Symmetry: D2
Subunit: 461 residues, 4 copies
């Protein structure tokens, strides 16, 4: 008689379970943590509020936390990223989950609230797992008393880490956090190679457009921009890259990309005259990867080549000025998460109009919105880190400290390199890779232990 | 030429050719020439006396003349016996700059050349700055001329191996002057160490052997910055590349980058026995490249097990990555041409000229890109050497040797340049490609919590 | 008004299909240029075309181009899994007879072809054939030979179908001439190669969502499909090994940077388990067949494959993989449509948590069309512009109206002239925004060509 | 006391021989033919005039022909392509060779005539091996009586095949020829992959320029243009391709290149107004690959970005208008086969002038002029075909046949596919590749012999 959930269709659970069983075989680091810690139950007594894309991969994360002793209440961190069969399998296992693909904004907020409240009252949560900081922000702003019981937050992604660091700087962060993003087995695995796999995947599923031979503009060249540019270049696109960071721009040049700005002299003065119209008029596909606001702006959208594809793979949809397109242009749905935006006006459209753009997932995370996000074998790294971060903070019991001790303990830290290397070794073995063991003389020669860590903390890989 | 005799180079008559190539290189090095124009008037290195030890290439020539143009006097040697470009050395000597370097030095001559920079007219020069690549000059100063370090304000160290040696001295309390780790600027490590080897590894293998690489099997030992660039140098030519690593994080990157990760040893266990060698794997390898900065990562038993006619080379800083001593002791060497030897595994005394059981060793195991070609191209070295100039300016202006003891104790460290300067070097490199960097709006800068002028990333950022 | 001469999965998908056709038209400039160039001339007026080819959105644009040029058609798919149901619905809603849906049974597949051949229970007065793989051509020759007396020609899309035509020609059983559409360069070296480059990894991702980077693939074949397939996987970071029986194609694989291996020790396939390179196959995470041949992923290979390997076929017919052996001996667990786990533990049921299974895509049928949407519109533009030109040419030649003595002189399998191949290519290049340079008169004389082409001798291989 | 030769330096012979011994291990198809036919001596009595780049690879071909029974007299087919240590080794073996790197044009003709003449009179030659048609043309125009005794020509390269087909079309070809170029193990091996290996090799040796991140324009996308474009793209260049053949241009697009013209709308009207000056002003490297005339013309050279590199990898230097540059601009030699061309004027230059182009090999074949051309394991395919072609035409004995039988055989032909396959099989085994053998049922199913040929003659690979 379990009813503490809300999903699109519970009858998808058997399908979800079949895909979970396959996904476990693709996630050796995560499944390895089940075997290594199950006897010790390190999360016994943990009550975790979780807010992250309710995919099949997240299902294996959830059931790992539960297998190690935790109770959880779960929601997705995006309105389009849930896989309904994954949400169904989790609910059918008796786990509170509130998530479906295609939520409204109101339903999204309601879903997070259903994790926070149990039977109309605040749940006795003591841990937080977040992707983007939305759950973290709601707790700090609307339920601050609950944070007096919480031992820590483990944050998945670059945008959420920024929000944590803002609070730490302002002295408004109430509990310590682990920056899971900046494990190398996360940032340089998930953010880069994950988007390499899943960006062209989502574009093909949404449009079935040939990419070879066509012109792309990628805004940003951090980890997501690097992986996105490679996703397109390996398909044969001619990829140009925009950046505000000269070091990242240098990498794009050395990686074989032309570095350009949407704006003359790179100066974004807000006018149509600033736009390089010759450049924008040649672009078949624009992808935003920045975590910044309005990097594909109204004047760029006006200048784009007819029938260009526009999408965003950064965390939030304000990278693209979709508000401008809602106010001024008519949207024609092709199929779910694919809209033609007719630049002829707002008052309806000609079905045979040639002057439109194609927007994917309404500007939301395109790899999760139009496909299934990163593959299991990549998310294995990210989620093995999440499990270790949950154990790490839960075992330190910050919430039980007096205030003076809490102040000394309050931090936003990454996991130690030894754990990063432990995750990596399990990933490598999953590929059948064989790591070489240093001899004693060799370890002494380069100044490391045979067991690692093999690099100083300054190392960038 | 003229009364100036304070140099030793292979052939001073190569100077005009060297000057022609320097003028071309200047056009390829906008960050370095940007610093030359920016600081020429202020002469920030006026009074600096720099001992320099780094590959005497055309690129180093532009570095040397930038330091001199900013006011420094220098005395120079190469940090490798095979890396000098003789026309570069000739052009520098012809400019009146003391340089002791030629391609193909003996080990004794290599040491002599470093000492000729340290000594002027039989007595220590009044040096007050050090620029080093690998730590050889740093070590000679600390061991044999410790009194000279009393007047030296800092060391600017180019490469990973040299930085490791500096950090060991700092931990032991034996480092006498502060240093800047030039290697770990992003416009150095993630430009020079990676993309430089991408350009110059397959370059050197082609010049030495003219072997087709496409379709052949390679084993790259290591997947740090040099191993990453080296693996790409070979894969982009169509080699089937396998990668060995001891670091599981670097091994993970190799897998995701599309390489098979293997070990020369069964189950990765290097117990010193021949039985531990994966002979089936090594018997398929046409090319092995060492990239580690470690010792004996291509060992005797690996060399015995390699496929006949395999090429063996090293692109790490020191030749002890390969057990060439084993090969000198046991096998007959046949020089094909300079820096290319066939190593006949049939025995030590003489060889059959038509023997099929040989390996081809490049540069006698020394840095192959510089030994068999010309190292990294000017436009890549632009980044490394702009950082060197900025590092020399910073430490010279700090004047460590003149500070009170309490201030010395606070500044005796190994530091990197601030990220703002890394970004400023990068911006000039991007402009050199014709790239255009976008300026954040005030609102966008506020949104991500940076200044419009940068820095754009926290110091934790790995790029 | 009362149109019932069709059978599709769901007619209410038509509006969706029409939205996708309107998009595809903007992606197919060569085909739409033919529609615009020839519509007023109506060169296919009087043509009655039996068509058998994957009922995709791309085929919809082809169908409506033929109709726009004056043809009547009756259509079926050439594979049980390749139809896009919204494309079929849009074509039926346009009043065009189409019999096609995704997930046909073999009996339904044959019934659909027969529904194009028969109209109101009697042979339609067809006079042209468009085919992809030769199934319709075979049924006509075997079961409706009297209909071929009135047919002017066959335009055949794919390598396997052309092989079947040439077999009939050498045996003296081919009844009407054909155009080999496959061997236009804007077909074979566009569709067969780059199309599979686009759609192979596409279909694997949609079926399994497996990471491909870092994993080991074996591609059987290195012809045009094998070349494009190998690139589809290598560009994702797979470690790709290639098998071939043709030493020239094997040479290309080596030079392209692949290791060339055989499933069999020393390449010798003696039919025993002992001849299988068990060490090699035990490392393979994905095997793809691309040959047009029979049993190139055989029962002993399937027994030796690494646990949880993915098995798929992108050649025309499913007999490249011995799926019959898997049906007879192993238990099939459906993951979702066109994705099956095949449990090698036995035939009578399976442990839901068994680790010893293979993942088979599309039941061994063409995987790019079965698990995704096949080639993209802008690639199919080239193939289908060639189809329209081939239909025009054979229809205008009117073979069926010739005396028997003249039929014998005209009975052949031919390709389109290079000048038309070039004209298709030029529209494709313009579609990318590319600008082709024009020779000066002196340059044209220097290399011995006309300024307008053709630019290459017929021997040229590109 | 052998003195029937002319080389730069005979003392380089020991070095040349060391490199020949290495090269033999890289050339299994050619050395397999040497071992296979040694007993038969199929070229006994053959007297071959040879004209092809005097490289180490050509040295292995020469000694294979001699090992099969031929006498030869040899010259290079380009003034810059000889490797002097290869020529010296061949001369020190007692084989007449007239070739050095850096011949003048007058010396080039002298070397060919030295092969044609022995002791001041025409040699009793009966076979021709040519690369580009220069020797073929001299024989037809200056020594026509010698062709009465010659059984055939085996021609290496696309440009020479074109010249043979023009002669045949005009009725002026006096002896039959084999088009060696169009074996698949030549055209789609040598012409493509050879240039992939050796184009960026030569640019690096000449200039040591970084290529990654810079802009290249490749003129042509036939086999040489395909291989050249890959040579630059794999280094990270942003490569644009020009073509007059829309089918080749289509391939360029699908292969991920932008297709552009030096001329506005592709129309070359001979004036500066027709040049796309914006495009050419951004180009760092131009490579001509066409076999055509004046495809990098004077107006393009005027418009190129300052300090652009200019080079040609087609057979003849007239692809670039070097005559215009000799007439109008000042040439500064950097080093052999590397010249700065100062666009400031004819009489002298400023040593610090910034307005120059860098020309490689004076517009001659750049891979052979500034490096060593294709590697041994690629030339293995081409030169195995050469040996088979020489055997076939010499055994046919055209010069001995009565006139009507000559008329049946006066043609330009290719080698049979079976032989193409057998060459390829030896190349594959050289990589350690394992070709699978068809079962009898499989061979019947696709309609081939288990032994091949495996493809119809129409097949394009
Ligand atoms: N969709 C996914 O699966 C996924 C995965 C990981 C992260 N993310 C999200 O993607 C975003 C980027 O993550 P990241 O790790 O790459 O961050 P990052 O800091 O590594 O890179 C962002 C880059 O954007 C650049 N940038 C900022 N403003 C710009 C502008 N106006 N124009 C051009 N470039 C600009 C910055 O210089 C920086 O290099 C974040 O929102 C992160 O949460 C998404
Ligand atoms: N030739 C050049 O132009 C050039 C340029 C830069 C640096 N270097 C030199 O190259 C070397 C490598 O520099 P780097 O920056 O890449 O250093 P790095 O620390 O980034 O990488 C070295 C890698 O070797 C691996 N390794 C160590 N021992 C190993 C073993 N036994 N087997 C396999 N892998 C092993 C380490 O795990 C590490 O990832 C140093 O000596 C450096 O000074 C040469
Ligand atoms: N799925 C698609 O969209 C699509 C597209 C075009 C063609 N096709 C089909 O794919 C198949 C291949 O077509 P193609 O154009 O590449 O033909 P092809 O003749 O160019 O290539 C087939 C290759 O298979 C090789 N081969 C044959 N038997 C083999 C064996 N036992 N082991 C290894 N290699 C073997 C042959 O040597 C040949 O090179 C045909 O059935 C064709 O109709 C499919
Ligand atoms: N350097 C080498 O090692 C080497 C090797 C093989 C051949 N070659 C020579 O290279 C040349 C090309 O050989 P190929 O086999 O590639 O010939 P090809 O016929 O395959 O290709 C030449 C291409 O040039 C294109 N072209 C002609 N005029 C053009 C123009 N004005 N603008 C743009 N493109 C134009 C043609 O359309 C054609 O596709 C020949 O001279 C050949 O002898 C050199
Ligand atoms: N060309 C070069 N000059 C100096 N140091 C280098 N290190 C690598 N390449 C170099
Ligand atoms: N190395 C080489 N030898 C002879 N002819 C060639 N053509 C291209 N490269 C060559
Ligand atoms: K997924
Ligand atoms: K250099
Ligand atoms: K499609
Ligand atoms: K060569």
């Amino acid at each position: 008689g379990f009813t503490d959930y809300k999903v699109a269709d519970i009858t998808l659970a058997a399908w979800g379970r079949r895909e979970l069983i396959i996904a476990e075989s693709e996630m050796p680091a995560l499944m390895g943590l089940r075997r290594k810690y199950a006897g010790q139950q390190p999360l016994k007594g943990a009550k975790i509020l979780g807010c992250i894309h309710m995919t099949i991969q997240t299902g294996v994360l959830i059931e790992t936390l539960v297998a190690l002793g935790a109770e959880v209440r779960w929601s997705s961190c995006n309105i389009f990223s849930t896989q309904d069969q994954a949400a169904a399998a989790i609910a059918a296992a008796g786990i509170p989950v509130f998530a479906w693909k295609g939520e409204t904004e109101e339903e999204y907020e309601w879903c997070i609230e259903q994790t926070i409240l149990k039977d109309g009252q605040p749940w006795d949560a003591n841990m937080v797992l977040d992707d983007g900081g939305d759950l973290t922000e709601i707790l700090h702003k609307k339920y601050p008393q609950m944070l007096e019981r919480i031992h820590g937050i483990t944050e998945e992604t670059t945008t959420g880490v920024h929000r944590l660091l803002d609070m730490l700087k302002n002295g408004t962060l109430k509990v310590p956090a682990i920056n899971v993003n900046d494990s190398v087995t996360k940032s340089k695995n998930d953010n880069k190679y994950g988007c390499r796999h899943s960006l062209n995947d989502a574009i093909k599923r949404g449009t079935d457009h040939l990419l070879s031979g066509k012109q792309a503009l990628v805004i940003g060249y951090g980890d997501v921009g690097k992986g996105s540019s490679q996703s397109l270049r390996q398909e044969g696109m001619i990829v140009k890259v925009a950046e505000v960071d000269p070091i990242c721009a240098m990498q794009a040049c050395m990686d074989g990309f032309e570095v350009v700005s949407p704006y003359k002299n790179g100066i974004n003065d807000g006018t149509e005259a600033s736009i390089d119209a010759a450049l924008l008029g040649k672009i078949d596909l624009i992808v935003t990867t920045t975590g910044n606001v309005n990097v594909c702006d109204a004047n760029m959208l006006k200048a784009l080549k007819k029938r260009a594809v526009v999408c965003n793979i950064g965390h939030f949809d304000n990278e693209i000025d979709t508000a401008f397109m809602r106010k001024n242009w008519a949207w024609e749905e092709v199929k779910p998460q694919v809209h033609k935006i007719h630049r002829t006006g707002k008052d309806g459209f000609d079905a045979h109009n040639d002057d439109y753009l194609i927007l994917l997932a309404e500007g939301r995370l395109v790899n999760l919105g139009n496909a299934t996000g990163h593959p299991s074998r990549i998310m294995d790294g990210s989620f093995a880190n999440q499990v270790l971060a949950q154990i790490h903070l839960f075992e330190q019991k910050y919430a039980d400290l007096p205030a003076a001790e809490k102040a000394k303990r309050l931090s936003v830290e990454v996991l130690p390199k030894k754990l990063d290397e432990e995750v990596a070794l399990e990933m490598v073995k999953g590929f059948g890779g064989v790591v070489t063991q240093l001899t004693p003389k060799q370890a002494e020669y380069i100044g490391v232990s045979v067991e690692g860590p093999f690099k100083p903390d300054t190392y960038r890989y």
